[PDB]
Amino acid sequence: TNFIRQIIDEDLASGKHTTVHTRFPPEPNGYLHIGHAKSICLNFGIAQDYKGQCNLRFDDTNPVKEDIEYVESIKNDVEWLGFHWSGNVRYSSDYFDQLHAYAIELINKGLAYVDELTPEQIREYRGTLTQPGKNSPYRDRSVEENLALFEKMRAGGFEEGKACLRAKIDMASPFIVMRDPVLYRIKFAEHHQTGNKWCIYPMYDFTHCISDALEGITHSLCTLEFQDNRRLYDWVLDNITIPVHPRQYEFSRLNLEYTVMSKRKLNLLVTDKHVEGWDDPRMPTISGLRRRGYTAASIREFCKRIGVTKQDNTIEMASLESCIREDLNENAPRAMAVIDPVKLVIENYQGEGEMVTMPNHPNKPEMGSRQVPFSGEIWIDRADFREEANKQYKRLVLGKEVRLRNAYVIKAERVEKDAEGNITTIFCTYDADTLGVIHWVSAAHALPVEIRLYDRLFSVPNPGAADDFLSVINPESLVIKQGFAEPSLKDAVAGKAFQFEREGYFCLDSRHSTAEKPVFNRTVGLRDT
RNA sequence: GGGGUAUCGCCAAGCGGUAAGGCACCGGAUUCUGAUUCCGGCAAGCGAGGUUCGAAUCCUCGUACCCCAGCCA
Ligand SMILES: NC(=O)CC[C@H](N)C(=O)NS(=O)(=O)OC[C@H]1O[C@@H](n2cnc3c(N)ncnc32)[C@H](O)[C@@H]1O
Q1: CB-strand contact A7/B, under 7 Å
Q2: Which residues of A participate in the annotated binding site for L-glutamine?
Q3: Which nucleotide has the shortest C1'-to-CA distance from A306?
Q4: Boundary (domain end) residue, out of A426, A446, A466
Q5: Domain that includes residue A181, residue range
Q6: Burial level of A159, CB count in 10 A (0-12/13-18/19+)?
Q7: What b/e readout covers A128-138, taking b as 16+ CB neighbours within 10 angstroms?
Q8: Which of the listed residues A52, A234, A355, A517 has the most CB atoms within 10 Å of its CB?
């Protein structure tokens, strides 16, 4: 429950509404991100929980900012998250003729006029946060003139910026949005849905309430920046001949630490090429989170966990991570991979290897077991061998043994180095029937793999607030390693994620991995303390 | 000027009745993943008054922060 669901209850009880009808209206000017997922779970979850409906509407009022690429993706991510919208997908542009007819009703009613103040002029006349605005000299034209002037605008008779339709409200309002807001402006730009049938486009404030009203939205849910705009939303509906009046409720938008959640900044990372694309695994987009290895289910739990309030907030990465870990910890099958490999030779082992039975999920036998090859020339992670160590360092020491994962207890008794004194091979001896701990990979049956270790995109908790957010990008957000995975991973499918024991949850990077060079994405590492 | 928000490190309940839950964090028990699971601990309600038997929940005075001067959304 949240303040909005409590409002909905009250409405239902009082009898103000018998059903609920919400909507998610993203402008198609970028890809969806985790914040949108908060708005999606909210609007679609509420709908289904109350057995109501929720529309997907593309608020496409600004042609020069949108693209058909984005609409195809948005539907995609909405469905991927697990939600279904009511009826066909809606577009604000589906109401372009209705909006126009309404502008004419306002004009006829005397509440709108065609203003000819330049774009700089309008701002000069607008007033300030503490100084009232002033009426334009064109404010008092006749209904007849406004009707003709507006049509002139519609027919392409005016150059861009040369005219616009404004609402005749109150230029001294303490609410800046009520100081004769613009309803329509001239843009000779082709629209992704209506082509070039229109040269004048409606503004958000005029478009949003009418679309909602027409669709029968019972609760228009949006973020806090639109708190001031509500006054205009109610004005527009109070002043046109329309049968319903959806009510608006605002909540705080999600902010996630170490990341930027704004289409404009996410666009820049994409445009300047500082990430592979909108779907780069380090991106906070739904597609990036997906490519990274997140489950639509873990994102929904995330939204369920963070809540819906009016308090501004900034969630920590730890919280999101807890969600995906909680999912993959139970569902992911274990496997063996080595990110940094140092050769280890068990001179005590004779033969060309053998096979060892390995569990697919330690704490869950039902997931089955697999047969993995063992031998005397394996691979281990460098961090596992230390010539020296305290009572706590549990791995391999140059005068001690350790349990090779799902296999034998071995004991390092020598080592060998190269020029820089870097070790190249560790010589050990194994025990007969020996079946800390360490994962491994037999060098003979080792699938060469490209591992991708991701990290926070930015090096500061609040990159948005930085002077130039791009200069604070983390140079280690991605660190590509060549390692070795046990041969079973040979059949990894870009879709499932396995747990690389003692390392993290990886998923076949569904973007670069060829049949020859598999590329794996590290979704999230394990909790390490 | 106006609109909003002020609870534990981060979120977030409680809506006059005597402070939930999650994440983080500090311990302990398990464990062939220093993981998991597992129990145990953890603070708190902007200041100042004011009504009340009693408020985090009501009221006033402040204070702090956030949003609004796109022919963006
Ligand atoms: N009255 C409204 O809802 C305004 C819709 C407007 N077209 C819009 O803001 N376009 S948008 O594409 O930028 O966003 C669409 C909706 O996504 C949600 N949203 C966007 N960013 C969000 C964030 N960081 N946290 C939570 N919710 C967020 C809002 O409901 C937004 O309206």
Answers
A1: no
A2: 59, 204
A3: B11
A4: A446
A5: 93-201
A6: exposed
A7: eeeeebeebeb
A8: A52
